[PDB]
Amino acid sequence: TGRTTIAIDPVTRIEGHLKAEVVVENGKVVDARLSGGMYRGFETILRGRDPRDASQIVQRICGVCPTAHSTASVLALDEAFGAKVPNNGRITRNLIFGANYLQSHILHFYHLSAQDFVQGPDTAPFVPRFPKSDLRLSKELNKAGVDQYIEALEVRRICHEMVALFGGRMPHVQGQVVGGATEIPTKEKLVEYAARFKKVRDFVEQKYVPVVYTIGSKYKDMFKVGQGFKAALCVGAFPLDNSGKKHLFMPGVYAKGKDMPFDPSKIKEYVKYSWFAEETTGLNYKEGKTIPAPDKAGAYSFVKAPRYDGLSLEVGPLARMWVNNPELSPVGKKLLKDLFGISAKKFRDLGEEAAFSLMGRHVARAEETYYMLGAIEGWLKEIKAGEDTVVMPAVPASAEGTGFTEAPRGSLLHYVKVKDSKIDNYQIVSASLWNCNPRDDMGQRGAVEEALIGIPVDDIQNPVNVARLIRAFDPXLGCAVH
Amino acid sequence: GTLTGERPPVFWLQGQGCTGCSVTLLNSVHPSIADVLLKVISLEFHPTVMAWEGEHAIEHMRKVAEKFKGKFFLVIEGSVPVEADGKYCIIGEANHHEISMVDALKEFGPNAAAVLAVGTCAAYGGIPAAEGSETGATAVSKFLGDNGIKTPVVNIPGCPPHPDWIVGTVVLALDAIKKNGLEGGLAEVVKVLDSDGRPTPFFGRNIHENCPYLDKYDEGVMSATFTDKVGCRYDLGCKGPMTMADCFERKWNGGVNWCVQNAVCIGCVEPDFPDGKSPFYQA
Ligand code: SF4
Ligand code: SF4
Ligand code: SF4
Ligand code: FCO
Ligand SMILES: [Fe+2]
Ligand code: NI
Ligand SMILES: [S]
């Protein structure tokens, strides 16, 4: 067959506003363009404010991942202010934020992604849908998916109770500020966190990780597509001591089959294909500028195009798991053997092709959720009830700072420059910015645009695999554009 | 409710939102969100959670809107940006035509039974409308009024709202409609809105006058660090004195905490949030 061009706007079962346009020729995607169609402009809204306000304002970039923005912001402010966060505050922050990793991954797999593979009940918002939706599961396994979707609604809510115990509320925590965490954990509230955590652990271990491998085993073709550049970024996250040198996820870049160090000075944001003024192209975030140009010819997105030493990279659980290569979960090792005939011990034993795939990204996210359980358990042993978690630092007249972390969807940094005791510049380089960006000034595609190449569309009237690929990356367009 | 009961159609449109108003609703304890979706409302369009996509999802909404003209509820999450001919928020494409948030609210707004402006962005403009913004972010009621659209609006603010304020306002409205029909019922709802369009059951009481630390405020005993939970939070920036919400009682996330206990109130339900509540961390 020849060409068909397909536009999907809105792409649903993601966060935020995304259009995807693909060119299909002879049953495969041969080109793609992603458009982030909504802009707010946090980087200009923030200017002129008391810098301490940033750790509230920036959370409103995204109500799915606000703790990530809170974390990046307070780390940037800590650096700019010279605030020395007490050890117990570092741990408390990890407990606040780590709980939202659990929430976000569970939300993503069940409430955003699972309908790609599972037929829901016969009422809105589960119908109508494509007449040929390629839903392959047996009646029993489909019902398990539905039952687990329903249970996961309660589990993800419990995760937000965990966030709020020391975070105040969620979405939009109150409990992280420059200088640490606003509430010392008490023995009684640590009991309450642990009791909820046990319920989440049991769901992750018994339901979520098994179902991803089991559904994956009915969609083995989905490990053979979606590779894109096979290039990944991790900037580090969840500090494990007070040195700033040791993190649960350590930084690194992977591209063209090679591991490389991460040097943040090599990040530049391009705008040729983005709705920003041309004279702002190519800036590192320390000199970043955000000047909207919604009428600029040729542009197709409010997402800038970040490149790392010229490379187009992806971020998220796959990126972190690939860069760090942890041991696989016990149940993953077992199900890889039983259901796939694969003997594996560490994440990279999946191989590059299967890891960097549509279904590989779902597997990586499930494995990472399991991995986070152990980190949270460790923090619950390490925390000291009653020990102070905050310092109260004076606002500097002139300063700068950068906070680096890993949001659930991938690498996140915030940069702040303070002048006259107010925000002079604030620049955000977020996870779905790395994934869901448009072409750069040389015409090189963004990570998801490239991962769409080769996706099968054997039925142009039911082109389900286009958005299935997109959803594997867990896009968040509020984050991508800000 | 029951799986086979009467459930009115709802379209949930996101403008310049962060999805936090949707997520807060997912946190409803009772009724649970599963019960809301399966037993209380029929959520026919919602970009974050619905099965279908793209032009097909838009056309589904349009078919339901025609069948239920004058009778569907329209939830708005996020502000509506008017600058640049609406281009700062494109929500879909159908018939080779992009649909801005401006377009969508002009299309569906006139035909809704009522518009629920959920969250401070939709209700009042919020952060997207704050100083330093340039998109013409506009509150729902102002946008509709500027365009001659007379459909009733109820504001359910907060950044985010508590789920109980969202679900509770729906329940208030559906009860009034069961007793009085649609027009009589909406008239009863309007009677219990304050001057900022907020239901007085949830927004009729001031935080500070009901705060557990009020004695400390009156004694002048102020915490100097966030982690001192004995003193009043006023010197740390608390906006409870200026804020109308029931958080002191209801608390957050299954009752496990609330902003004043944990840190400070930032006044998130108020029409001047954020700029009139800033700086957040000093009086
Ligand atoms: S009101 Fe707050 S939580 Fe709701 S969409 Fe706006 S920024 Fe997000
Ligand atoms: S903590 Fe806030 S709401 Fe409570 S008494 Fe003090 S100023 Fe008022
Ligand atoms: S206590 Fe204040 S900031 Fe917190 S939710 Fe209530 S009104 Fe908003
Ligand atoms: N997770 C998350 Fe949000 C995105 N993309 C950030 O950063
Ligand atoms: Fe940015
Ligand atoms: Ni996000
Ligand atoms: S997050």
Q: For residues B127 and B167, is the Cβ–Cβ distance under 8 A?
A: no
Residue of B46, B89, B159, B162 with catalytic role? B159
Rounded to whole angstroms, how far apart are CA atoms B249 and B93? 44
CB atoms within 10 A of CB B6: 10
The two three-digit tokens of residue A342, written as one number: 């694969």
- Residue of minimum CA distance from atom 5 in ligand 4: A432
Q: For residues A394 and A117, is the Cβ–Cβ distance under 8 A?
A: no
Catalytic annotation present for B159: yes
Contact A8 B53 (CB under 8 A): yes
Q: Which conformational region is residue A246 in: left (phi greater than 0), alpha (psi within -120 to 50 degrees), or beta? A: beta
Question: Is the minimum CB–CB distance between A38 and chain B shorter than 8 Å?
Answer: yes
The two three-digit tokens of residue B270, written as one number: 């108020």
Secondary structure class of B233 (helix, strand, coil): coil
- Residue of minimum CA distance from atom 1 in ligand 1: B119
Rounded to whole angstroms, how far apart are CA atoms A87 and A437? 37
Interstrand relation of B90-94 and A422-429 (parallel, antiparallel or unpaired): unpaired
For chain A, how many structural domains are there in total? 1
Residue A404, class by beta-carbon neighbours within 10 Å (0-12 exposed, 13-18 middle, 19+ buried)? buried
Residue B67, class by beta-carbon neighbours within 10 Å (0-12 exposed, 13-18 middle, 19+ buried)? exposed
Instruction: State residue A339 phi and psi, 5-degree precision.
Output: -100, -20
What is the least distance, in Å, from the CA of A180 to any CA of chain B?
10
Compute CA distances A247 → A175, A237, A241, A251, A318, whole Å.
21, 6, 8, 9, 17
Signed CA dihedral, A97, A102, A107, A112: sign only = positive
Identify the CATH number of the domain defined by range B203-283: 4.10.480.10
CATH number at residue A399: 1.10.645.10
Which residues' Cβ are closer than 6 Å to ligand 2? B 207-208, 211, 213-214, 217, 232-234, 238, 240-241, 260, 265
Rounded to whole angstroms, how far apart are CA atoms A352 and A346? 12
CB neighbour burial string for A236-254, b if at least 16 within 10 angstroms, e if fewer:
bbbbbeeeeeebbbbbbbb
Catalytic annotation present for B247: yes
Please report residues of A whose CB lies closer than 8 A to that of B87: 294-295
Q: For residues A222 and A216, is the Cβ–Cβ distance under 8 A?
A: yes
Amino acid sitting at position A350: L
Q: Which residues pair with A3 in a beta bridge?
A: A25
Rounded to whole angstroms, how far apart are CA atoms B118 and B22? 9
- Residue of minimum CA distance from atom 1 in ligand 7: A65
Please work out whether the CB of residue B259 comes within 6 Å of at least one atom of ligand 3: yes
CB neighbour burial string for A342-381, b if at least 16 within 10 angstroms, e if fewer:
eebeebbbbeeebbbbbbbbbbbbbbbbbbbbebbeebee
Q: Which conformational region is residue B95 in: left (phi greater than 0), alpha (psi within -120 to 50 degrees), or beta? A: left
| DSSP H or E stretch at residue B177 | helix B163-191
Non-local CB neighbours of B165 within 8 Å, separated by 6+ positions: B156, B158, B199, B202, B203
Residue of chain B with shortest Cα separation from A48: B132
Rounded to whole angstroms, how far apart are CA atoms B271 and B283? 19
Longest dimension (CA), chain B: 66
Q: Which residues pair with A311 in a beta bridge?
A: A308
Residue extents of the structural domains in chain B:
1-202, 203-283
Please report residues of B whose CB lies closer than 8 A to that of A182: 226-227, 262-263
Please work out whether the CB of residue B269 comes within 6 Å of at least one atom of ligand 3: yes
Q: Give residue A478 CA to ligand 6 midpoint distance, Å.
A: 6
Contact B262 A169 (CB under 8 A): yes
Q: Is B89 annotated as a binding residue?
A: no
Stated in angstroms to one decimal place, the resolution of this structure is 0.9
Contact B53 A120 (CB under 8 A): no
From A41, A164, A172, residue closest to B256, measured CB to CB: A164
Please work out whether the CB of residue A354 comes within 6 Å of at least one atom of ligand 7: no
Contact B87 A61 (CB under 8 A): no
Rounded to whole angstroms, how far apart are CA atoms A165 and A335? 35
Identify the CATH number of the domain defined by range B1-202: 3.40.50.700
Strand order in the sheet with B153-156: B42-45, B9-14, B72-77, B112-118, B153-156
Rounded to whole angstroms, how far apart are CA atoms B256 and B246? 15
End-to-end CA distance of chain A: 40
Question: Is the minimum CB–CB distance between A199 and chain B shorter than 8 Å?
Answer: no
Secondary structure class of A50 (helix, strand, coil): coil
Ligand that comes closest to the CA of residue B76:
1
Q: For residues A199 and A161, is the Cβ–Cβ distance under 8 A?
A: no
From B44, B53, B268, residue closest to A12, measured CB to CB: B53
Mark which residues 385-424 of A lie under 8 Å from B by CB.
388-390, 392
Q: Which conformational region is residue A316 in: left (phi greater than 0), alpha (psi within -120 to 50 degrees), or beta? A: left
Q: What share of chain A is helix, strand, coil (3-state, %, to 5)?
A: 45, 20, 40
Q: Give residue A430 CA to ligand 6 midpoint distance, Å.
A: 9
Q: For residues A39 and A275, is the Cβ–Cβ distance under 8 A?
A: yes
Determine which of A34, A38, A127, A457 to mutate to test the interface with B (most B C-beta atoms within 10 Å): A38
Closest by CA to B268, choosing from B157, B132, B162, B168, is: B157
Please work out whether the CB of residue A177 comes within 6 Å of at least one atom of ligand 7: no
Rounded to whole angstroms, how far apart are CA atoms A53 and B267? 13
CB neighbour burial string for A166-201, b if at least 16 within 10 angstroms, e if fewer:
bbbbbbbbbbbbbbbbbbbbeeebbeebeebbeebb
Longest dimension (CA), chain A: 69
Q: Is B247 annotated as a binding residue?
A: yes
Closest by CA to B226, choosing from B211, B238, B242, B241, is: B238
Q: For residues B81 and B88, is the Cβ–Cβ distance under 8 A?
A: yes
Q: Give residue A404 CA to ligand 2 midpoint distance, Å.
A: 34
Q: For residues A222 and A471, is the Cβ–Cβ distance under 8 A?
A: no
Domain that holds residue A339: 1-482
Please report residues of B whose CB lies closer than 8 A to that of A126: 50-51
Secondary structure class of A394 (helix, strand, coil): coil
Compute CA distances A437 → A59, A360, B28, B65, B258, whole Å.
21, 21, 34, 34, 37
Please work out whether the CB of residue B260 comes within 6 Å of at least one atom of ligand 3: yes
Q: Give residue A451 CA to ligand 7 midpoint distance, Å.
A: 24
The length of chain B is 283
Catalytic annotation present for B18: yes
Residue of chain A with shortest Cα separation from B84: A294
What value, to the nearest 5°, has the Cα angle with vertex A101 and ends A64 and A161? 75
Question: What is the interface size between A and B, counted as CB pairs within 8 Å?
Answer: 266
Closest by CA to A237, choosing from A412, A38, A108, A65, is: A412
CB atoms within 10 A of CB B69: 12
Please report residues of A whose CB lies closer than 8 A to that of B253: 160-161, 163-164, 169-170
The two three-digit tokens of residue B172, written as one number: 């208030």
Rounded to whole angstroms, how far apart are CA atoms A391 and B228? 12
Catalytic annotation present for B89: no
What is the least distance, in Å, from the CA of A78 to any CA of chain B?
15
